[PDB]
Design a binder for these strands. Sequence first.
RNA 1: UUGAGCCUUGAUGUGUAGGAUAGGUGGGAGGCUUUGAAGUGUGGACGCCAGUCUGCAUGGAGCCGACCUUGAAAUACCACC
Lengths: 220, 537, 50
Amino acid sequence: KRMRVIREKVDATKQYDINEAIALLKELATAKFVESVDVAVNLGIDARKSDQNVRGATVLPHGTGRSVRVAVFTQGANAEAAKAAGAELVGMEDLADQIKKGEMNFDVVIASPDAMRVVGQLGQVLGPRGLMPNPKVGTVTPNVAEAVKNAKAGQVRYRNDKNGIIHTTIGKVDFDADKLKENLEALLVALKKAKPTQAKGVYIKKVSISTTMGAGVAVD
Amino acid sequence: MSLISMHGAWLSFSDAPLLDNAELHIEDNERVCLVGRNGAGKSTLMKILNREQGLDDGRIIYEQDLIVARLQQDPPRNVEGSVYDFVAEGIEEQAEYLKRYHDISRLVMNDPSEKNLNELAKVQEQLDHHNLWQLENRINEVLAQLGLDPNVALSSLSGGWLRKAALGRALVSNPRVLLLDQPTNHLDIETIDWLEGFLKTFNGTIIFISHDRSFIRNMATRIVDLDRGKLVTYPGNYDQYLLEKEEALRVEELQNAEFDRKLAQEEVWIRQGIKARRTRNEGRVRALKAMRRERGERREVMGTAKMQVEEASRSGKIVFEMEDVCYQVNGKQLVKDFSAQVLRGDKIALIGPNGCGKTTLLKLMLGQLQADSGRIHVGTKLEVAYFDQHRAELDPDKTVMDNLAEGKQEVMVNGKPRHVLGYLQDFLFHPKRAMTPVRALSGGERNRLLLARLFLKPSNLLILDQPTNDLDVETLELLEELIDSYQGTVLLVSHDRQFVDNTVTECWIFEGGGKIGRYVGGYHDARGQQEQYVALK
Amino acid sequence: GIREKIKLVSSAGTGHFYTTTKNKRTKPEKLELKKFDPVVRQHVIYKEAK
RNA sequence: UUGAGCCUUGAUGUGUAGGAUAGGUGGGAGGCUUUGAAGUGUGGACGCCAGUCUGCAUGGAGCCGACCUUGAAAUACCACC
Ligand SMILES: Nc1ncnc2c1ncn2[C@@H]1O[C@H](COP(=O)(O)OP(=O)(O)OP(=O)(O)O)[C@@H](O)[C@H]1O
Ligand SMILES: Nc1ncnc2c1ncn2[C@@H]1O[C@H](COP(=O)(O)OP(=O)(O)OP(=O)(O)O)[C@@H](O)[C@H]1O
Ligand code: NA
Ligand code: NA
């Protein structure tokens, strides 16, 4: 239906510019929804090698329209002061799964950079989606305000799909059209700043802005 | 567009070259089968790819990140552990990325420094592609996929189960390259039937050596020879290879005779009279010198090893009699109230599922372990020849000559003891390689050597626990004829079908709950009566 | 001429090797002899190689 | 009418639990659907046979995410795929 109408409304085979798409992409927004944006950039890397795999940390002011209440794990009292300063719960190290018996892990990683009170669940269940904080993406730091500032600064993680495509929330279409261009510039240089060592040909293969139930346009 | 490459390879122990200038090509998601006669070097190629030894003059180029693990052909000797222990030791290389991540949290248990912050990149450098987080919820996972329990002492399992453990320990690492040296040896039809779907679904790439002419057909994308130092591939189904290989053997036999024809008539000419004042061109004497030198070449026919048994005086008319015998292991019953007789010249095949007591049943007959009840009476003029499942009667370090005929010269052949060490030439052992320790021999070579010294002594009785595990069909064909014509008693154990339709005339089909059903005929006849059983209501 | 030449590369890291012969068809085991390493000037364990 | 690459347009993806043949990462909550279903059978096709895919007209507006009982959850755009 609407998919049959909209399939003529876009011409995704073609190529466009950083600005000739903002109005071209919002035409599909007739549907009543939250419109959870699913921007898509195709990356050029030998994805099925290990060394070229990259994971990123970022900060954005616009946010995503839905913050994450992620608990912090630290052996002892790593959650007794940061729990009230940017966490839904202060996950005690001695009770690592205690505050989250049903949900053993929170939405976000646990910031106990000085505390090694647990590797975490001892069974990898705390790594179901990669929640162990590491210095490669800077998720490990004893300063709770670093993770506490995550809520006030909107920390977003990157993903290396088995083909090599990064997906992130943008600050869903609800917001303006210039902030999308600001958002792209943030993720552009900061991901260019995040580029690993090995590369071939171009680096950023393709760029597109889309949604789970929203059509896209090849930004370029 | 390529996975493992080998160019200009060379491998030659202090002997003729195992590997000449040879090449290999491994693609994505292919099941390649290696088919070569016994002692030809299929296992040593597997050790080359697995980064284990050799390749003096050549280059191996396989990509990094390519995890390779293999399954050996002979059962291990670290048997005194436990199943979970033996299976676990297959992640030895993965045990380092696993252990550092928990270890170097101690450096970050203090203040975050460059040496402690930069570490999380290093230990998790490998982690992105691998799983590495659940190397206890995967090892225990595979058993629920396989069937073994994790905490049973592994020095106890049967030959079929011990082989299963070695197929798991080579698969915990989840390798991209699976090298299966003789996968189906002590398995039953059910295990083989299930394994034919496990490997087909398997995502990576499989290289395997199998002597099963029925397992190969179901799973072989490409087939590889490795005949006499050179390996060549072949297209089509399995039966194509047999046809194309025979042409390669016939033509090579055809050209081999022609070369001898020239050299034959070039030696009548070397010793001919000169005549009057002629010279005898040295452009032909030097060529003959090059022909005689070229005769140090490969013998195209390996030699169809010849064998013969040593019949002895007739045994008593009753070989084994056991009634009311009921032996049961702790948990389940293996034999429950048996009552059977074995007469002279009766050929019996023990068949059944894995670990159902076939090997232990023979142990009761020879009195290795004592029956719980019922009593067993043994024959009166028996000369037992025993072929264990695991060979176990040859020390791997003792020399080939001494293990054959128990460290003595003067074998007895046919009529009278007028033979010594020529008994190897009947089995295609070169007399030069007679001091080789037995551990150096290939699996099939070791199978024949144990077979050789059983047919070396007088015997009225044969017990064979899978005598044809590693033998090729050419050598297996002779064993079918030898055992058939054998006058004395024969109790043999085998998991294949074609072999028991030509040697045996009865079966003892195993059932659960310690019950043994004795049927009449070869394998297929006995299974035929087992469909039509009505069990005496 | 059965015997084949081999070399014993040092385990002390310093690129160094003695060379010798070995009857490979009667000695499947690999030699491991303790011998001088003049680069490090200590007695280390020399293991077989190409 | 034939053999390789593209560009989409169409379908393919069973270790098991289990709703059932269940591809990664999605990010979500609710969409679809009425240009008219659950259905009726149809026809090539599929089987690793328990099904999942669409023509063909009669009828044609009711089914799904939801709790999870899992390694990873919902045939619910499109991203080189
Ligand atoms: N370490 C060694 N030292 C010397 N000779 C060896 C060594 N390993 C194997 N050989 C010999 O070289 C050949 C290689 O044996 P290998 O085990 O590779 O045979 P195979 O083709 O796998 O045999 P099978 O078909 O019986 O399984 C054999 O003739 C063997 O006797
Ligand atoms: N030494 C032992 N200690 C404990 N249990 C044993 C021992 N040897 C065998 N068993 C058990 O006895 C049963 C029969 O073992 P056996 O070696 O007789 O098997 P099998 O019937 O010959 O089977 P397969 O064809 O698999 O070798 C199995 O349950 C096995 O685990
Ligand atoms: Na056995
Ligand atoms: Na072998």
